[PDB]
Each structure stands twice: as structure tokens, then as C-alpha cells.
Amino acid sequence: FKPLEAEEFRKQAHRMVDFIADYYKNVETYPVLSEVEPGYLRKRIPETAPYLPEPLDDIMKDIQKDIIPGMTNWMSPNFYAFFPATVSSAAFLGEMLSTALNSVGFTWVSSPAATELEMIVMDWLAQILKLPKSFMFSGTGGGVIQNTTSESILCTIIAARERALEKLGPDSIGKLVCYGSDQTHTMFPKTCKLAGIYPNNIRLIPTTVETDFGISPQVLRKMVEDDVAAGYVPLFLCATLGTTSTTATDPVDSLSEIANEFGIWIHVDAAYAGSACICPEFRHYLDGIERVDSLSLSPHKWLLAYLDCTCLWVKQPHLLLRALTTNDKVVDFKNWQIATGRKFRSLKLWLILRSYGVVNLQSHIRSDVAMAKMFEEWVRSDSRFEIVVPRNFSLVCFRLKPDVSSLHVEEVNKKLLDMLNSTGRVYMTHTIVGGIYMLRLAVGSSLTEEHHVRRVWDLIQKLTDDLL
Amino acid sequence: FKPLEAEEFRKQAHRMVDFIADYYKNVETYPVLSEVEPGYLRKRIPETAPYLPEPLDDIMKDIQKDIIPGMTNWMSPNFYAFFPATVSSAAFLGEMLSTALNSVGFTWVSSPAATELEMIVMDWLAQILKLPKSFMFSGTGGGVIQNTTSESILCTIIAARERALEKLGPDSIGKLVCYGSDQTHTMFPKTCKLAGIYPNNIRLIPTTVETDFGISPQVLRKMVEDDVAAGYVPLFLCATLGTTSTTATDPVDSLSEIANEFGIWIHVDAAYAGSACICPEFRHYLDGIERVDSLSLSPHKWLLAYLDCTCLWVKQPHLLLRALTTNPEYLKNKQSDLDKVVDFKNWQIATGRKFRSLKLWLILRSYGVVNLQSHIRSDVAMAKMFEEWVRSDSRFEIVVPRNFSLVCFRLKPDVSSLHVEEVNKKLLDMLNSTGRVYMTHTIVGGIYMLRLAVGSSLTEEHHVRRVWDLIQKLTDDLL
Numbered sequence: 001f002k003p004l005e006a007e008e009f010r011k012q013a014h015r016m017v018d019f020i021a022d023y024y025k026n027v028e029t030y031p032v033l034s035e036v037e038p039g040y041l042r043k044r045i046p047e048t049a050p051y052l053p054e055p056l057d058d059i060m061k062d063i064q065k066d067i068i069p070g071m072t073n074w075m076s077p078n079f080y081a082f083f084p085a086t087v088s089s090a091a092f093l094g095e096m097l098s099t100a101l102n103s104v105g106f107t108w109v110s111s112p113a114a115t116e117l118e119m120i121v122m123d124w125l126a127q128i129l130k131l132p133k134s135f136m137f138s139g140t141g142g143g144v145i146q147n148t149t150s151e152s153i154l155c156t157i158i159a160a161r162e163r164a165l166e167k168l169g170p171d172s173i174g175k176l177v178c179y180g181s182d183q184t185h186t187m188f189p190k191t192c193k194l195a196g197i198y199p200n201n202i203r204l205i206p207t208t209v210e211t212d213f214g215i216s217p218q219v220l221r222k223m224v225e226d227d228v229a230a231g232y233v234p235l236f237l238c239a240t241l242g243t244t245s246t247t248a249t250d251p252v253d254s255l256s257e258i259a260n261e262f263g264i265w266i267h268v269d270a271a272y273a274g275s276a277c278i279c280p281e282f283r284h285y286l287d288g289i290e291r292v293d294s295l296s297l298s299p300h301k302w303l304l305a306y307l308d309c310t311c312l313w314v315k316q317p318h319l320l321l322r323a324l325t326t327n328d329k330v331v332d333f334k335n336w337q338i339a340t341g342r343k344f345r346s347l348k349l350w351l352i353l354r355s356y357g358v359v360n361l362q363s364h365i366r367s368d369v370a371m372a373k374m375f376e377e378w379v380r381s382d383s384r385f386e387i388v389v390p391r392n393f394s395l396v397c398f399r400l401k402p403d404v405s406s407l408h409v410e411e412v413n414k415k416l417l418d419m420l421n422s423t424g425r426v427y428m429t430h431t432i433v434g435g436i437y438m439l440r441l442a443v444g445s446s447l448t449e450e451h452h453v454r455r456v457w458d459l460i461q462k463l464t465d466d467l468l
Numbered sequence: 469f470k471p472l473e474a475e476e477f478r479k480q481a482h483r484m485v486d487f488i489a490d491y492y493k494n495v496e497t498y499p500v501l502s503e504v505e506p507g508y509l510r511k512r513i514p515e516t517a518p519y520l521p522e523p524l525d526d527i528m529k530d531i532q533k534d535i536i537p538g539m540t541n542w543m544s545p546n547f548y549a550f551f552p553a554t555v556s557s558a559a560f561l562g563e564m565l566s567t568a569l570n571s572v573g574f575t576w577v578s579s580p581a582a583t584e585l586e587m588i589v590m591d592w593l594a595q596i597l598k599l600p601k602s603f604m605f606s607g608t609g610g611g612v613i614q615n616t617t618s619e620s621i622l623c624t625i626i627a628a629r630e631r632a633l634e635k636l637g638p639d640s641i642g643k644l645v646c647y648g649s650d651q652t653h654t655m656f657p658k659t660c661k662l663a664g665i666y667p668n669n670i671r672l673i674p675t676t677v678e679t680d681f682g683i684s685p686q687v688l689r690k691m692v693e694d695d696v697a698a699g700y701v702p703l704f705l706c707a708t709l710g711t712t713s714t715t716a717t718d719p720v721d722s723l724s725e726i727a728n729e730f731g732i733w734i735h736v737d738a739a740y741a742g743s744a745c746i747c748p749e750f751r752h753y754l755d756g757i758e759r760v761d762s763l764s765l766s767p768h769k770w771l772l773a774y775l776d777c778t779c780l781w782v783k784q785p786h787l788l789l790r791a792l793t794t795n796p797e798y799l800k801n802k803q804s805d806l807d808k809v810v811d812f813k814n815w816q817i818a819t820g821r822k823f824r825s826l827k828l829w830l831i832l833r834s835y836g837v838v839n840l841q842s843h844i845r846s847d848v849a850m851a852k853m854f855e856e857w858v859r860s861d862s863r864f865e866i867v868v869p870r871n872f873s874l875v876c877f878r879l880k881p882d883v884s885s886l887h888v889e890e891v892n893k894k895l896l897d898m899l900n901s902t903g904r905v906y907m908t909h910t911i912v913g914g915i916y917m918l919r920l921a922v923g924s925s926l927t928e929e930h931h932v933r934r935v936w937d938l939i940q941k942l943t944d945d946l947l
């Protein structure tokens with residue numbers, strides 16, 4: 001019994017490549033969101049694994065018949081929910097090869113090219129973002145490719161916690177206060193809690209439509225000063241560049257000043273919008289980055305990398321390294337993350353950069369921003385709709401105005417979202433901000449072209465005519 | 469600019485398939501361990517990314533010329549270091565497809581098939597491991613596919629911590645004590661520190677050659693009772709089934725009885741050896757698993773999955789779920805619910821997730837339980853054979869019993885007038901310098917030993933034979 005034989009591998013893999021290309025060619029045809037009910041797959045797969053081998057033909061048949069029809073097609077050109085997970089063939093080749101090599105790069109020794117290429121690729125990316133040398137290995141800082149935003153933030157939070165605890169002792173853990181926008185409320189508190197921050201020391205900064213739901217420096221300063229007056233230790237601040245709901249932007253320039261002033265570790269989460277900062281017209285959003293303690297952004301969101309791919313830059317690596325242990329030209333990346341093992345994470349990023357070039361990456365950002373701009377202009381031309389909050393990037397938040405119906409505005413927009421999604425011809429999610437229910441169009445799915453967005457607007461108007 | 473066009477994709481991906489198959493076909497030819505010096509790759513790549521696109525031909529050339537020669541070839545049939553990362557074409561198909569679909573399965577709604585198939589696969593595997601129904605979604609427990617052992621252990625540690633903190637209040641964190649074998653002192657303490665365990669409340673249980681460096685239950689009981697007497701709260705016990713150094717085995721049956729007695733959450737780390745427990749002649753290592761709080765094993769170690777793939781089962785998911793959320797509404801309701809479907813974001817550190825279960829499903833379906841057992845047995849048989857060869861040479865000695873696929877051995881001290889440790893270190897260095905083999909060493913109980921970690925998917929019987937021949941030749945040269 002040979003699980004890996006090169007020629008059998010070659011045959012089966014070519015067949016899978018063709019199946020995948022056929023899927024990319026057909027997905028526009030499938031309903032974006034699936035109609036299966038919960039538990040449907042339990043009635044279609046046996047309850048125990050087979051003693052005996054099954055032929056690959058049977059498996060592929062079952063995938064087409066029971067798995068894919070049960071999928072939400074994130075790759076559909078008509079997927080506009082959450083944030084697109086953007087892709088590219090260069091990145092897929094990087095994934096294929098990095099997996100096939102299947103190395104574990106916990107140390108430079110356990111695979112030198114992997115570690116060195118990660119350092120190089122992180123410095124490349126730093127230079128495209130025009131970050132100070134204080135974030136670069138060639139300079140005084142560094143970076144690491146993590147899997148997620150959640151674990152990157154957990155790492156920076158633990159670094160800050162450990163600096164505090166070594167200064168003041170472990171029993172000071174009950175004094176440490178962490179701050180995040182009320183717009184990061186489904187992930188930032190979870191991360192703090194994982195780290196042992198007391199429940200009442202996780203503080204959500206209230207925000208209003210008056211700041212476009214970005215953190216108001218005044219508000220955070222008042223909170224920090226009340227906490228210091230009460231004897232607490234302000235420790236960590238998550239500034240979000242592009243919230244998941246409306247892509248609000250916290251002001252890095254002023255918030256980093258408050259952080260520096262109070263010894264607060266400031267981390268900028270730009271999982272989605274950070275990628276736009278490769279374009280000079282978006283780079284002002286990172287003004288003040290030189291004062292910032294850490295920054296992260298997710299290529300597997302808006303930069304053509306598949307899941308997983310999150311970049312984390314740190315200005316003072318030694319604090320992170322100290323935090324993550326119980327005791328030159330190269331690093332051992334096990335020290336920059338939670339676990340020991342690691343894939344060859346940097347290969348696909350290298351392949352993306354080399355294959356496409358900064359020019360095309362900028363073109364790609366700008367093309368998505370242009371299609372969202374166009375869609376917003378369409379929305380403004382229809383007096384029944386309104387843009388609820390400013391479009392800063394690729395996401396348009398919009399809704400039916402209260403005066404189009406005598407029923408509750410929320411119920412009317414919920415019904416419209418339902419009609420749209422039940423069509424199968426589009427997937428969009430909603431959000432609630434400042435008590436206002438709104439629809440979102442998150443433009444960016446790699447296969448989306450301009451006519452897809454045109455057709456979505458046409459569908460929205462058709463269903464709204466039917467609805468009113 | 470179209471980063472994704474189906475036909476260009478088809479072309480380039482076919483080309484990469486042919487390249488990858490050629491690498492699998494030729495890797496035995498490359499030196500296993502690389503000779504590059506630190507910083508070698510900086511002198512061969514530009515300091516900045518290019519403005520304009522580069523042709524794929526140039527990139528492939530650079531991968532052949534600057535990357536692969538800088539790799540440690542984990543896929544070589546002559547790689548015997550650490551623990552092998554075993555692979556299979558079924559799993560590679562799962563990786564390709566899981567990636568191409570590029571779904572984000574944070575909730576059931578965000579892709580039903582991904583979540584449902586994960587539940588089914590975890591129950592399949594649980595049954596092959598003959599775990600009680602208390603670890604199954606079809607029963608009263610559950611499981612999740614994580615990336616690593618470190619984050620699985622971290623999650624169970626936080627679950628235990630939060631059970632304590634909700635009982636006693638947050639300021640009691642300074643009383644919570646975690647216990648682990650001194651044979652797991654590189655990963656386990658780091659994890660405890662990450663969860664906020666006070667530095668002095670992370671306790672390594674001393675082990676001796678008298679128990680083959682497995683945890684002595686008596687030792688642990690004495691430690692726990694002294695901690696209770698001093699007012700501490702015993703919280704978490706990490707029992708290791710197959711330590712990284714010598715694949716020592718902590719006794720699940722007695723240790724779990726102790727965990728139950730003192731209210732300690734016991735987690736069984738079976739990253740490597742757990743896969744072997746799919747074979748009846750190894751299932752005894754899980755005797756007592758019904759008393760255990762959580763269990764993990766890594767398919768990307770010994771079950772033909774590529775990196776990453778770690779399976780985690782939990783007997784009381786609600787403790788994990790409470791631990792991993794701040795949601796006031798979920799935390800106020802203290803009951804079990806009628807839902808038949810989960811949102812796996814609640815079972816992990818992050819929100820997003822790949823379609824992780826697909827490749828495991830394809831492994832199980834494509835090979836069958838019988839063949840998977842055959843694979844385990846094949847690696848164990850090659851290791852037993854290698855041990856038998858070593859015992860036939862009176863210059864060498866087996867330092868600790870071979871429990872699975874890893875053989876720990878050394879040159880006896882009396883074979884040379886030099887210090888035994890230096891003699892064995894010189895032998896290891898010569899071996900690795902050959903380029904025809906890679907082995908790591910370990911120090912356990914003050915004893916320096918070489919390790920042979922058999923299992924790399926391309927390794928066949930003649931490879932082990934030739935490694936042993938080489939070892940003997942280099943030993944002859946060395947004396």
C-alpha cells in the first residue's frame with residue numbers, strides 16, 4: 001500500500017486541476033447561497049468510515065452531488081457578502097507547491113529558504129506600504145506571516161501584557177485595561193479574554209455617526225484618564241482601519257499619539273483595508289504609523305492570497321519574542337507565533353508579488369474601488385435609496401429610505417435582502433450600526449466584473465419595484 | 469487586469485502539477501539537509517518587489533535554483549528527523565479543492581457543507597479510535613479540526629481556566645496550577661504562559677529512566693496534594709502519548725483517575741502516536757479515555773494529511789464554548805440546545821477557517837481503515853526491524869524501548885576512549901553531512917542519543933537498510 005506514488009499522484013492531480021477549472025468556469029451558474037437545511041449531509045454520508053477503499057470516481061461524484069450544492073460559493077462573481085476572499089492563479093500555484101513540499105519551518109535550520117524568504121517578503125511588503133525602517137528586518141523591526149487577524153492580535157496583546165507583568169508582577173493582571181472600538185465587538189473582546197484580561201477591563205469605546213463610527217480621540221483620552229485616575233493600567237488599544245460592518249477608520253495619527261503618551265501599545269488592524277494602502281491615494285490612512293506598535297493586514301482578504309494569509313509587523317520584536325517564550329541574520333519563526341509548526345507561508349506571497357507586480361496590484365485595488373464608486377453613484381440616482389455612511393473603500397452601505405413605506409424601515413430592508421438572497425443570483429449580508437439597519441455590497445470577489453455589478457443593481461431595482 | 473482566468477489557471481496549475489510530481493520523483497536525489505549559510509537568499513533576491521510583472525519561467529527557474537536547494541527535504545525517503553510529516557495524493561486533492569473553493573466557514577450558514585462534513589468526519593475518526601459516545605456530535609461531546617497542537621492545548625487550557633474563574637472569580641488566577649511532564653517542556657509551558665498562568669504555577673513533573681520517562685502517577689499525586697495543602701487550585705494536566713524526544717507514554721488510565729479525583733482537566737496530547745491508536749494493538753494506550761477531558765492528534769504527523777491538520781475532541785463542548793466567547797446572552801443561558809449544527813468560529817481562536825475536513829474525508833474514503841492501519845503497521849515494522857539490526861551490534865545500545873516508529877539509540881561508552889557524548893555527536897554530524905540522510909538527536913535523562921523517526925511517506929524497506937549500512941560504515945571510519 002503506497003499512499004504517495006509520483007505517477008498516480010500526477011494523474012489524480014491533473015484530474016483535480018481540471019475539476020477546479022471547471023468549477024471556476026461554472027460557479028457563476030450556481031446559486032451563491034445554498035438552500036440546504038441543517039443536517040442535510042448527515043442523511044447522505046454513511047455514519048462510519050469505510051473499512052475498504054473507495055474509488056475516486058465515487059468520491060468526485062459525491063462531491064458534485066452533496067458537497068458543492070451544499071456550499072456557499074465565495075468565488076462566485078455574484079458574491080458580495082462580508083468581505084471577498086480574493087484569489088489569483090499565482091497564489092494557487094504557491095499553495096500547491098508549498099503544500100507539496102510540506103516542510104515545517106519552525107527554525108531556520110528546519111528549512112532555510114522558507115525562513116529567509118519570509119523575511120524578504122515581509123520587507124518587500126513593508127516597502128510597498130512605505131512603512132518606516134523600524135518595521136523591517138533590514139532595519140530595526142520585523143514581521144511574521146500568521147494565519148489570522150485574531151491570533152496576530154492575541155500575540156500583540158500578550159506581548160503588551162507580558163511587558164506590563166514583568167514591570168509590575170503577575171498580580172498586576174487585574175489592573176490592565178484594553179480598549180477597542182465598539183465596532184470591533186465580535187472579536188476584540190474574545191481575544192482579550194483568551195489572554196486573561198479581566199472581563200470588566202475590556203473597554204469598548206462608544207462611537208457615533210458624527211465620527212463615521214470611528215474612534216473619537218477625545219473619548220478615548222477621557223476613558224484612559226479616568227482609568228489612570230482610578231489606578232488601572234492602560235495596556236493595549238486596537239485601532240481598526242476598516243471595520244467589518246461599515247469600514248469605519250479609526251484615526252491612526254491621533255490615536256497613536258494618545259497611545260504613546262500613556263504607554264499604551266497600539267495595534268492597527270487593517271485586515272481588509274490595509275491592502276488599499278499600497279496605493280498612494282490611500283496611504284494617508286497610515287499617517288502616524290511610525291508611532292504605532294504593531295500593524296496587521298490580511299492578504300487573503302483583499303490581496304489575491306488564498307486563506308490563510310495574515311501579515312503582522314512589529315516595531316519592537318524583542319517584546320513579542322520575550323512574551324512568547326519561557327526562557328544575527330536569521331530568525332526561528334516558532335518564536336513569533338503561538339505554535340511550533342508552520343507551512344512555507346511566504347512562497348505564495350512571493351509568487352503574487354513577482355507574477356503581477358506592484359502596478360497590477362494597485363490596478364486591482366483601484367478596479368474594485370472604481371466598481372464600488374460606480375455602484376454608489378447608481379444608488380444616489382434612485383431617490384428611494386440612501387447611502388447610510390461614507391464609502392471609503394470597496395464596501396457600499398445602503399438602504400431603502402424610511403419614507404418609501406409606512407412599515408418599519410428595518411423590516412422593509414430585511415425583506416429586500418431576503419428577496420435578493422432567495423433569488424440565488426446574489427449573496428449580500430446586512431449590518432446594524434447606530435441603530436440603523438443597512439444592506440452592504442462588498443465588491444471585490446476575484447471573478448466579479450463590471451457587468452456583474454450592473455446586473456446586481458438591476459436586480460435590486462427590480463425587486464424593489466416588486467416590493468413597493 | 470484579471471488575476472483569475474479559468475483557462476490560464478488550468479494551464480499554469482497543470483504545469484505546477486508536473487513540476488511537483490517531478491520533485492516527488494527526484495527528491496531522493498537531493499541532499500536531505502541543506503548546506504546554505506544564514507542569509508544566503510538575501511544575495512539572490514532583489515531588495516524590493518518589482519513594479520512590472522515577471523514571467524513564470526523566470527520564477528520557476530529561481531525556485532529550482534534558489535529555493536529548493538535551500539530547503540530541508542522533509543519529503544525525502546531519507547528524512548528521519550523529528551517526526552515525519554506524512555502525505556498522500558488523496559490529501560493533496562483535498563488541499564487543492566479546499567483551497568480552490570476558498571470558503572470561509574466561520575458559521576454553518578457561511579457554508580453548510582464545510583461545517584457538516586467536519587462534524588461527520590470527526591465522528592468517523594472518533595469511532596475508528598473507538599472513543600466513547602461522549603466525544604461525538606452524534607452523542608454528547610464534539611470535536612473540531614484545528615491547525616496545531618499548540619492551539620488545541622491552548623484552547624483546552626483556557627476552557628479549564630475559565631471554568632475555574634467563573635467558579636472562583638478572576639483574582640483566583642494566581643492559584644491555578646498546571647501540570648505537565650518534563651518530557652514536554654518546550655511547548656506546554658509556553659502554552660500555559662499564553663493563557664496567563666502565573667510563571668510559578670506551571671509545574672513540570674520529573675521523570676526517570678525507571679518509568680521510561682513517562683509520568684509516574686504517584687509523583688503527580690504527591691505534587692497535586694502538596695499544591696492543595698498550600699492552597700493552590702490544580703487546574704490542568706497535559707498527559708502526553710508519545711513525547712517528541714523518545715515517544716515516552718504517560719499512563720492515561722491512572723492519570724485520568726487522578727484528574728477526576730482532584731477536579732483537574734486532563735488533556736491527552738497524542739499529536740504523533742494517537743494516529744497509531746487506529747490499530748487494535750495500540751488502542752490500549754487510550755484505555756481510560758472515557759475519564760479524560762480532551763484529546764488531540766495531528767493527521768499532518770502520522771496520518772497522511774499535509775500540514776496543517778490537528779483533530780481535537782472535547783467531552784464537554786459547552787465548557788469550551790463558554791471559554792471562547794464574551795457573548796453575554798450565550799453565557800447567561802446555562803443549558804443544552806436543540807440545534808443540530810455548529811458555528812466552528814466558537815470552537816477556535818479565530819473567526820475565519822478553511823474547508824479543513826475535506827482532505828480528511830478524502831483520506832478516509834480513498835484508503836479505508838484497513839489500509840490506514842496497514843500504513844501505521846508498515847512504519848512500526850520498519851522501525852522494529854531497524855531496532856533489531858541495532859541490537860545485533862554490540863557497539864550500539866537501545867537507550868529506551870521503541871514504542872512506535874521512533875528508535876532511540878547510541879554508541880556504547882566503551883567503544884571509544886573519547887567521551888560517549890562526543891562520539892555520538894560526531895557520528896550524527898558525519899551522517900547528516902553525507903547529504904544522504906537527516907537525523908536529529910536528543911538529550912534525555914542526561915543521556916545523548918540519536919533518533920530514527922521512520923515514517924516519511926516515500927521511505928521503503930531498502931532505504932532503512934541503506935541508512936543502517938551507512939551508519940555502520942561511518943562508525944567503522946570513526947574508530
Ligand SMILES: N[C@@H](Cc1c[nH]c2ccccc12)C(=O)O
Pocket residue numbers: 104340341342550551552553712713768769
Ligand atoms: N516533534 C518534533 C518535530 C515537530 C514539531 N512540530 C511539528 C509539526 C509537524 C511535524 C513535525 C513537528 C520537535 O521536537 O520539534
Ligand SMILES: N[C@@H](Cc1c[nH]c2ccccc12)C(=O)O
Pocket residue numbers: 082083084085244245300301572574819820821
Ligand atoms: N469578515 C467576516 C468574517 C471573516 C473573517 N476572516 C475572513 C476572511 C475572509 C473573508 C471574511 C472573513 C465577517 O464580517 O464576519
Ligand SMILES: [Ca+2]
Pocket residue numbers: 364367368444445446447448
Ligand atoms: Ca476585481
Ligand SMILES: [Ca+2]
Pocket residue numbers: 846847923924925926927
Ligand atoms: Ca511508509
